Amino acid sequence: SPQPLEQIKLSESQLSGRVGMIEMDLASGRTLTAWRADERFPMMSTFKVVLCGAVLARVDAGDEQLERKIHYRQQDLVDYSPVSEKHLADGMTVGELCAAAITMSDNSAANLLLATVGGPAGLTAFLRQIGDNVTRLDRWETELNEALPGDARDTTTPASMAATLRKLLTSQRLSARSQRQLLQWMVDDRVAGPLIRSVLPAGWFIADRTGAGERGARGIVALLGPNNKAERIVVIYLRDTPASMAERNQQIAGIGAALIEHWQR
Ligand SMILES: OC[C@H]1O[C@H](O[C@H]2[C@H](O)[C@@H](O)[C@H](OCCCCCCC3CCCCC3)O[C@@H]2CO)[C@H](O)[C@@H](O)[C@@H]1O
Ligand SMILES: *C(=O)/C=C/N[C@@H](C(=O)O)[C@](C)(COC(=O)CCCC(=O)O)S(=O)O
């Protein structure tokens, strides 16, 4: 592989789209690679990690319990609800909803949780409270994935998203147990986790949440590192490319390969 930045550039040339990327040490926040890190990108389903961070904050404050069962109706469901469709009769716990949102990208689960934190405005207020003044949620699932050009709704920047994920996982803003829970949800991703492991060299840790949207929007927020450690946050977004889903996946994987091959920086 070329160096990471050279590969990121190559991916833009090949996609005819914008890539936004940051590689950050999880423990310290050291930024190693940054490319369009201050430009806006649609979050897509990656917002689900911040959503569950807001849920966990409520749990820590005693205003929520992960055990609490929510009993929803079919009229409450949106597109792609693989877990939530199964539990119309018996409901799902708040924690089960988080797991379905993060590990399966269950959209109805994300919307039920969104309501509990005061909707998109409530989540945005949470982000401002942890000092993210850039990331914003404006819409519910599934409309938040629309990715219109020039539209600032439902966007983050690589730098903001990385800093916010670090705050949630490590800053002791969340309780120790809640930090551990958010991490485990990302470790348990079923959408991309097992596939990524299948192509990672032995010894490499992965945890992740992915997203996809219109106009080629694609993204991943991930923890990655050798020696089976979550050494770094890697955030990659793509926007405004006409490329196939397969090609977008391959280009992100190629950036990952360049990181792996040239890890010691
Ligand atoms: O010298 C480093 C390594 O080089 C190769 O590993 C390859 C691997 O065989 C390939 O499957 C992967 O593709 C990249 C797959 C990455 C998957 C997505 C990564 C995510 C992770 C977090 C966010 C960014 C994207 O590249 C690495 C590095 O060349 C060798 O196979 C391996 O034995 C060796 O230890
Ligand atoms: C979040 O990123 C959602 C992506 N698109 C979904 C949506 O708009 O609700 C779809 C329903 C596709 O969803 C999936 O394939 C699940 C995995 C999405 C992910 O990467 O997390 S839409 O039909 O594209």
Side-chain angles (χ1 to χ4, degrees):
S1 285
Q3 295 308 117
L5 221 54
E6 294 317 295
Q7 176 56 235
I8 285 155
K9 288 162 184 180
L10 189 59
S11 289
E12 290 204 348
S13 174
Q14 291 184 174
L15 292 167
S16 302
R18 277 173 203 262
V19 174
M21 188 270 189
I22 195 164
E23 177 193 18
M24 178 181 284
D25 186 282
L26 175 65
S28 78
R30 178 166 53 111
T31 301
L32 287 87
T33 311
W35 171 261
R36 305 195 188 273
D38 296 323
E39 300 187 28
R40 283 186 293 271
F41 291 83
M43 283 185 284
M44 304 151 300
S45 297
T46 69
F47 95 97
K48 292 158 168 147
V49 180
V50 170
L51 172 64
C52 297
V55 171
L56 290 164
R58 291 173 27 86
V59 171
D60 288 347
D63 294 318
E64 183 56 279
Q65 304 147 319
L66 293 182
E67 294 83 353
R68 180 173 69 103
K69 192 128 92 322
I70 297 183
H71 288 267
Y72 53 92
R73 290 162 295 177
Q74 191 156 2
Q75 317 89 257
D76 294 319
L77 301 177
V78 294
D79 188 32
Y80 203 64
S81 298
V83 187
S84 55
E85 284 171 13
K86 299 181 160 63
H87 302 108
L88 290 173
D90 55 58
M92 291 175 66
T93 71
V94 171
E96 279 185 312
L97 291 159
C98 293
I102 292 172
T103 74
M104 300 286 310
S105 209
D106 194 300
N107 297 325
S108 297
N111 278 351
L112 294 160
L113 292 165
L114 201 39
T116 78
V117 302
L123 188 57
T124 298
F126 174 76
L127 288 154
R128 302 292 174 272
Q129 150 177 170
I130 63 177
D132 184 335
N133 293 314
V134 179
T135 304
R136 51 181 288 184
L137 197 76
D138 297 270
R139 288 176 290 175
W140 306 75
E141 284 286 2
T142 45
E143 291 82 22
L144 63 81
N145 306 287
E146 180 174 40
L148 297 159
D151 190 351
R153 288 179 299 171
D154 308 296
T155 58
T156 188
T157 65
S160 295
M161 177 59 71
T164 285
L165 177 69
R166 190 173 163 263
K167 288 167 180 180
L168 291 172
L169 294 169
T170 71
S171 77
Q172 304 172 298
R173 282 173 173 86
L174 297 183
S175 71
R177 194 174 189 237
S178 285
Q179 286 186 340
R180 298 201 261 272
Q181 175 69 94
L182 191 53
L183 174 60
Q184 187 61 47
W185 284 326
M186 294 184 72
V187 165
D188 281 333
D189 176 46
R190 299 303 162 209
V191 177
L195 172 66
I196 291 167
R197 282 188 194 96
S198 79
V199 294
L200 276 179
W204 287 77
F205 183 111
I206 185 74
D208 69 275
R209 169 95 294 281
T210 58
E214 301 259 58
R215 281 154 282 275
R218 189 69 174 120
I220 184 168
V221 167
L223 306 175
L224 179 67
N227 302 305
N228 280 304
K229 184 173 173 142
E231 185 181 348
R232 298 192 192 144
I233 295 166
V234 179
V235 177
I236 296 170
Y237 290 109
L238 312 180
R239 70 178 305 159
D240 302 306
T241 165
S244 64
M245 177 75 77
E247 183 168 7
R248 283 137 63 207
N249 291 346
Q250 291 164 15
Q251 296 290 175
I252 292 171
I255 295 165
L259 293 168
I260 288 158
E261 278 174 56
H262 311 284
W263 191 252
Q264 301 174 48
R265 283 161 288 107

